[PDB]
Every structure is written in C-alpha cells, then in structure tokens.
Ligand binder design. Sequence first.
Ligand code: FES
Ligand code: NA
Ligand code: NA
Length: 98
Amino acid sequence: AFYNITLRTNDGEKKIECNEDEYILDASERQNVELPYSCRGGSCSTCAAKLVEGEVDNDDQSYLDEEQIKKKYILLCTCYPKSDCVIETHKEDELHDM
Ligand code: FES
Ligand code: NA
Ligand code: NA
C-alpha cells in the first residue's frame, strides 16, 4: 500500500506519498522534494531524518546505532514507510550534535 508522508523540511512542510515497498528518499525525489544524501546506501549520516509520528522499516540502514534509532532517527535513503508518517528532514547536524 501507499502512505502519505508529511515532510517537515528546512524549506517548509511538504506532502508526498511513498509506497511501503520503496524508500522515502526516492519517492520524495520524484515528487520534487529534494532531500539531503550522499552514499544513498544506508551507511552514512547525510540523509538523516527524525520520525515524529508513524511507523517505518529502516532495517536496511547500518550507520545509526541503537541509541540513535531509539531517539527516532532514520536514514531516508533506506527507509520504508509502514503507515502515514510525519518526518523532520535535514537532521544530520542535530544527530551529530546529540
Ligand atoms: S545517504 Fe548515506 S545513509 Fe542515506
Ligand atoms: Na542536494
Ligand atoms: Na566527529
């Protein structure tokens, strides 16, 4: 199924949908909502975001440790939505300065 993702970016709030079988980064990009990234493989911190509400499957990621995951951080390049979500983007620095 598809879920509606509310992206709270550094340039306002944007509404985009994403198939539960695809990554949020790719879905966002085709709907013209540019998000940060670099490796696009789940092993770095560039695409870091924070889950405000909703369920996701970000098990394909590998950079974030359990402490960061518990704090709701997710890497959008490898994150599947599992319900409607409200996500804050461009959180790499926040993550870095925890
Ligand atoms: S762009 Fe590197 S983990 Fe997402
Ligand atoms: Na960019
Ligand atoms: Na450092």
